[PDB]
């Protein structure tokens, strides 16, 4: 059908871990869904020590925002590279077919913009990332990645084909950073991107992240920015990792239904404690909360979680179920 005959809808994105408005079950026929993102090179402080890096972002955040469409919609993205940036950038959608996911068509120097359209022919959560030829892992591991969710037109389904409807959704982007270290182990900083590049390559070639964070920094999804839920709410957590495997775990909960490799035509795995999201993938986990209190949500390499940054929190409201768990004898002498 002629694409100029289709409805157009403009999305206004939100910063992760929040997700822009959308309907689970498609309330219209196929649409051209219009998005705009502005690339921002910016300094970011990523840890409690004050370590500051030169991040490369879509729309000012690490991760980039979650885009949401339905299967067989068209995604039309206007990608802007303002002249205040210094580098060449582009975008590759793992949801898309052809031209390196769009990367071959979206190369923008500072001061340029472009508009890409693709048909979202496969349902699932997918990574998107910058990928300039010859500099790909540098851009991705500088934070230049996010995700897109392509919902089935009739929403999510369980392993038996019955509906799964979330009440809340969050997007956790997990980022491995490779901050270059001197021989004593202290981070180096650099005066220009070119002067940094060889030691970024050197740091990356060790394959050992210095930091692994959610939402761009140690502690970002804690305190006043903890995720929230109520007992009995159905929550979908989309989780991406553009470059290394991760093993998400909700401490005190489960993934009731998990698409570990993120593709909704497949039945979910049930009752997961932990699951493996391969580097280069988005996964999604659905959970109905049953207990109030604090939860941690981690990469279950616990060194990565608690020493390198890959941990966030939920604060859950509601009543405690002593049938599901109780302290019979509280800690006491002997």
């Amino acid at each position: 059908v002629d694409i100029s005959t289709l409805p157009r809808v403009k999305v206004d994105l939100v910063k992760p871990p929040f997700v822009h408005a959308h309907d689970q079950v498609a309330k219209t026929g196929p649409r051209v869904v219009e998005f705009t993102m502005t690339i921002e090179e910016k300094k970011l402080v990523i840890d409690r020590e004050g370590t500051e890096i030169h991040a490369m972002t879509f729309n000012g955040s690490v991760p980039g925002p979650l885009m949401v469409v339905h299967e067989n919609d068209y995604v039309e993205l206007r990608l802007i590279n303002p002249d205040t940036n210094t580098l060449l950038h582009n975008i590759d959608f793992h949801a898309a077919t052809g031209a390196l996911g769009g990367g071959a068509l979206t190369q923008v120097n500072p001061g340029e913009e472009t508009t890409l359209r693709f048909k979202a022919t496969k349902p699932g959560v997918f990574v998107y990332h910058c990928a300039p030829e010859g500099m790909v892992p540098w851009h991705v591991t500088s934070g230049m990645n996010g995700a897109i969710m392509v919902l089935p037109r009739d929403g999510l389904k369980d392993e038996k084909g019955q509906p799964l409807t979330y009440d809340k959704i969050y997007y956790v982007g997990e980022q491995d950073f490779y901050v270059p270290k001197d021989e004593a182990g202290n981070y180096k900083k650099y005066e220009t991107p070119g002067e940094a590049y060889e030691d970024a390559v050197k740091a990356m070639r060790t394959l050992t992240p210095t930091h692994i964070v959610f939402n761009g920094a140690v502690g970002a999804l804690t305190g006043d920015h903890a995720l929230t839920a109520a007992v009995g709410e159905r929550v979908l957590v989309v989780h991406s990792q553009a470059n290394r495997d991760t093993r998400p775990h909700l401490i005190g909960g489960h993934g009731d239904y998990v698409w570990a490799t993120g593709k909704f035509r497949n039945p979910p795995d049930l009752d997961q404690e932990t699951w493996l999201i391969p580097g280069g993938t988005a996964g999604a986990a659905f959970y109905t909360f049953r207990q109030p209190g604090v939860y941690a949500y981690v990469n279950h390499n616990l060194i990565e979680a608690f020493e390198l940054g890959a941990a966030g929190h939920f604060k859950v409201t509601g009543e405690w179920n002593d049938d599901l768990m109780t302290s019979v004898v509280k800690p006491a002498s002997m």
Copy 2:
């Protein structure tokens, strides 16, 4: 139903890789299944060189013992921290719902004990581990982890819904250790836990294990402690890894039915050569032996297996099947 009306049964645990007595198919209604574990901080020699570490254990072993219940039983654990220990400990069950898996309710100083109860609402094999706030990966990577199996009340089923009944079960706990090294590469020892802690953190932050072992030491599941089976026996191998991914493989065999991420509501994967158990998970593999002789059971990063310790053996009794395999021409000149 009122929990005080339920039967109580006391389990007496056994040391891994053996598993305490149980019935695959539940012979009673739901029960409160009572367990006791005593925490033991102890020196352990982990390799053939004599490297000795200060391990932190549940019940004196690495891994902690396998607990076995059925779905919708209640697990009631008395956790004892004797005054001969020096540290604070607790326990998080990945099988449980709420309070950080129990960790928020089970904090015991030396000289204290506690009793936790939870409902085992989801069937599968699950990790349990110590997780004291601010010291989590140190305790887990000191050996303070084990697993619990929550059987379906009607036992295990194959991908078609027919029964799978094991004749024997073993529990392989796989442990990544991070023994601190000086600049020359030799292990350091320490005089107190506090004096060790920073270099343990430093060692962990390299993300590179020094040792990866089954049942607490290089070679533990070999020789007089090799696993055993007979041709035609059905064996379930439960395998856990609380902190890093592993890729188990039976050299000379297969996983006929594998729950790689350990959750029995899902159909197993058939005919696996190797499978991925993510860090923070227990998996289970069912195999019917068809050939006698020696088998190795490994993490199939073969460096991890054969240089770092992640290898055990089966000794299998019975008759050789030349239809399945034979040497047509034995090795000879030309």
Copy 3:
């Protein structure tokens, strides 16, 4: 049935990434399928810098060639170790049952040969590799591994049981090398295998590959050796990794049907962006091309892909579909 009554067919192998002739659906009853491989120790240049290693190969290549049979055929392999080699070698088939996959029966010194037969009782793609007791990871990580495909007798099937027929097949072997480095970071070379062995062990124990390549070298599956396809062709890519996990991704495409852990009795995963092939496994991905142009095929740890070597290309012929993807506004000022 008496094996001497069965047909014999001799296969003539081809060098990867190509695959010898075969029929998807079995056109005969069960056969003894005869293969010959000659071990070759040889120098190989593995990167653009000219780094040369002493590789250990089956049939002169890294990976060894793909062998193809059907379920319940017998594989009969004549393995030759010419006297021009210096080491002991053998072979373990993950497809086989008993005697360490054949390794216990196939130990050949230089100047010896042997013939092994096994029944291919399970359908899937499987690793094969050398595994001499006490030297296993050295041989495997020197390149001495390949794969075997055991097709179902009625060919491949989708998640619904309908046929999947490929038009083309390729075999990508992915190799992690551990070239020993001095303290300055430069590669060492060695005068004999014995003089190399300790530092190979030392290099392996770091767990950090120096190189991760497809088809034996950086860039091997590019340029005049890029993989090829046409729009509308159905392609199966078999991918093995004998020692470390990998996360394959077709840049600009998908895995339409993926057996990530390689075993065809299981339904494939649909619509994958990226998938996890555990170390010690072969996986297979089926894709129907929809767009022409250049694709990259990578391990989606992009550092591993673009800095360490784990990247190849497809060149795809045919017409561009602007409905699936188009540049609406090409990159331009503002």
